């Protein structure tokens, strides 16, 4: 499948001076697997997915160092940022990095990603060519001068092509199924509405992963209204899709459900 690795690095400073908080999270196939946070008494990288527990202390040693180096790198690059945008200190500031790579079905490297946001807005990004920087706004240009000067684009182009792909291979070996899915559980509920009308809410429960399409009708989604996919709390997920109907006209509607863990598309109608 479309296998991926990502590390989401965040640096926060708040008023009350001192030092920015550095969180770094890592994801394989969109599932959190490692985690670092400067707030802890003993700030280590900890394993987040039982299959990571098969890694020697020296792995946790070496990445705790590596992360302590970004806590460093981030502390600075935030200070330059306050510089560029000429901002008055003792306020909240946020700096964010998304790093990582995409793997084909042949374990081919498809694309790499390296980006940065400041104040939650895109600041600078490596293009897909892996040679040039897209820089939105003037302060981002300053940075783009430096990084072209310092061959920074070769430095990452190396990480994404070499070590990313390499460690992704291995994390996938470690995670053999540990591709497990959970089929969705669907009922259709009946909640009446004023003036000879009713609502048709179609719930899907217990599922994993979150990829879900809810379709009721034939083939009309115009009037319908649905909700943000949401975690159950246990691993699994939820969402629902409603539509307004005239009272007693209910029978013609079929709710269609599409999930990867299914044998086939499931459709159901209200049964009182």
């Amino acid at each position: 499948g479309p296998h991926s690795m990502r590390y989401f690095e965040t640096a926060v400073s708040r008023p009350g001076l001192e030092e920015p908080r550095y969180i770094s999270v890592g994801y394989v196939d969109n599932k959190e697997f490692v985690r670092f946070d400067s707030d802890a008494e003993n700030p280590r990288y900890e394993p987040r997915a039982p299959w990571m527990e098969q890694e020697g202390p020296e792995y946790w040693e070496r990445e705790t160092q590596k992360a302590k180096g970004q806590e460093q790198w981030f502390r600075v690059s935030l200070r330059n940022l306050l510089g560029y945008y000429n901002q008055s200190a003792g306020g909240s500031h946020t700096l964010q990095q998304m790093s990582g790579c995409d793997l084909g079905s042949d374990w081919r490297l498809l694309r790499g990603y390296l980006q940065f946001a400041y104040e939650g807005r895109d600041y600078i990004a490596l293009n897909e060519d892996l040679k040039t920087w897209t820089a939105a706004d003037m302060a981002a240009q300053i940075t783009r001068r430096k990084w072209e000067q310092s061959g920074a684009a070769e430095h990452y182009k190396a990480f994404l092509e070499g070590e990313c792909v390499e460690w992704l291979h291995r994390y996938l070996k470690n995670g053999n199924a540990t591709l497990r899915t959970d089929s969705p559980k669907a009922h259709v509920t009946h909640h009446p509405r004023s003036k000879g009308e009713v609502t048709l809410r179609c719930w899907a429960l217990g599922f994993y992963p979150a990829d879900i399409t809810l379709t009721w009708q034939e083939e009309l989604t115009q009037d319908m209204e649905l909700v943000e996919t949401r975690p159950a709390g246990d691993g699994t997920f939820q969402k629902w899709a409603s539509v307004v109907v005239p009272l007693g006209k209910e029978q013609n509607y079929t709710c269609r459900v599409y999930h990867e863990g299914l044998p086939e598309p499931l459709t159901l109608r209200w049964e009182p």
């Binding site: 590390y7 690095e9 990445e63 970004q70 690059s77 790093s99 600078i124 430096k146 990084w147």
Partner: peptide, 9 residues
């Protein structure tokens, strides 16, 4: 493993 950053912003 994580990416190691290079020159600062």
């Amino acid at each position: 493993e994580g990416p190691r950053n290079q020159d600062w912003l």
